[PDB]
Write an enzyme that holds these catalytic residues in place. Structure first.
Site, PDB file in Angstrom:
ATOM      1  N   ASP A 235     -10.794   6.691 -13.959  1.00 21.48           N
ATOM      2  CA  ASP A 235      -9.550   7.259 -13.452  1.00 21.48           C
ATOM      3  C   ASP A 235      -9.543   7.336 -11.932  1.00 21.48           C
ATOM      4  O   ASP A 235     -10.194   8.204 -11.346  1.00 21.48           O
ATOM      5  CB  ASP A 235      -9.365   8.650 -14.071  1.00 21.48           C
ATOM      6  CG  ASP A 235      -8.070   9.326 -13.688  1.00 21.48           C
ATOM      7  OD1 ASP A 235      -7.136   8.652 -13.191  1.00 21.48           O
ATOM      8  OD2 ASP A 235      -7.975  10.556 -13.882  1.00 21.48           O
TER       9      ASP A 235
ATOM     10  N   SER B 172       3.784   0.612  -0.205  1.00 16.93           N
ATOM     11  CA  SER B 172       4.244  -0.743  -0.521  1.00 16.93           C
ATOM     12  C   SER B 172       5.381  -1.121   0.428  1.00 16.93           C
ATOM     13  O   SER B 172       6.167  -0.276   0.870  1.00 16.93           O
ATOM     14  CB  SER B 172       4.666  -0.831  -1.988  1.00 16.93           C
ATOM     15  OG  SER B 172       5.161  -2.123  -2.312  1.00 16.93           O
TER      16      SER B 172
END
Length: 329
Positions: A35, A198
């Site tokens: 994770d 992004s």
């Protein structure tokens, strides 16, 4: 030193991936969920409430190298509302031949119903930054942090498969695992996550829109959660798609051919094939399928989950100034 381990989907939907981890002396092998969205290594154990165990458990009393960490306790809760808590041991921990000694292994005294019900996951191995660790009074280092000193390079890579096994590598970059080159982008650690920005997106064969999408790279989340207006623009291209309140998201006819989804990484572009965005039928036999791109509006942060990461080769660069690398594959 280096390590390499095979990671496999827990079901036919790629809900999550498990990787074998060896703990203690002699080694006890447990299947853990790697994770990058959290920072605790915790396991089902001989200490867990019996009615809450259905999993392979760790037994610290059978490991010659286990030591109790006096007075240390932990308690964690995750996005989905699941939680666990317990006490702490240190022990030897090996992943794909890479061995760390003195790793904090959090022993669950109690687990929430979601963990009980999932027979395939024996615990979680956190790979986010150590600032998120829930051990008190003194926080414990992640496996990656403890290993950095001996690694050939302070990196780990994630190569997740679509309905197929993949690989976690530690300490090296496998140049045969990807095509073209890796593009790196800055990481912010202010919130404890592998958080990055992004540069934009495109839907199918249409235009790339330059728009900053702040998000986290999270192997521990199944889907891709993006801003509402970006998700809306995607599903507008799918004639049968609608938002369903009873299913909790965008659903569409399983027979549709889904458009691809492109996200920007600096000046590079990562393309998620449409098939990857078809999560699967809402129910076996159903003619409706659940979408793999959903709105982040209710979560509070954008998450590049497994749907996104499995379309790429991802480099987690843990140098003093960390970065995230992406390559096509």
């Amino acid at each position: 030193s280096t390590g390499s381990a095979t990671t496999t989907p827990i079901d036919s939907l790629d809900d999550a991936y498990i990787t074998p981890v060896q703990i203690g002396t002699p080694a006890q092998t447990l299947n853990l969920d790697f994770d990058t969205g959290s920072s605790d290594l915790w396991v089902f154990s001989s200490e867990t409430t019996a009615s809450e165990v259905x999993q392979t458990i760790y037994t610290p009393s059978k490991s010659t190298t286990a030591k109790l960490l006096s007075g240390a306790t932990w308690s964690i809760s995750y996005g989905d509302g699941s939680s666990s808590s317990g006490d702490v041991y240190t022990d030897t921990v090996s992943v794909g031949g890479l061995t760390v000694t003195g790793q904090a292994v959090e022993s669950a005294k109690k687990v929430s119903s979601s963990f009980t019900e999932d027979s395939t996951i024996d615990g979680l191995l956190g790979l986010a930054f150590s600032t998120l660790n829930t051990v008190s009074p003194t926080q414990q280092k992640t496996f990656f942090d403890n290993a950095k000193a001996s690694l050939d390079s302070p990196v780990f890579t994630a190569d997740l498969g679509y309905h197929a096994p993949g690989t976690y590598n530690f300490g090296f970059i496998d140049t045969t695992a990807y095509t073209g080159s890796i593009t790196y982008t800055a990481v912010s650690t202010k919130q404890g996550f592998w958080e990055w920005t992004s540069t934009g997106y495109a839907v199918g064969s249409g235009t790339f829109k330059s728009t900053s999408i702040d998000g986290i790279a999270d192997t521990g989340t199944t889907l891709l959660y993006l801003p509402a207006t970006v998700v809306s623009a995607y599903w507008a291209q799918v004639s049968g798609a609608k938002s369903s309140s009873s299913v909790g998201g965008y659903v569409f006819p399983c027979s549709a051919t889904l458009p691809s989804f492109t996200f920007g990484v600096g000046s590079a572009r990562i393309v998620i094939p449409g098939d990857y965005i078809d999560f699967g039928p809402i129910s076996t036999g159903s003619s409706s399928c659940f979408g793999g791109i959903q709105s982040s509006a209710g979560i509070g942060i954008n998450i590049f989950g497994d749907v996104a990461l499995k379309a790429a080769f991802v480099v987690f660069n843990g140098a003093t100034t960390p970065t995230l690398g992406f390559a096509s594959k």
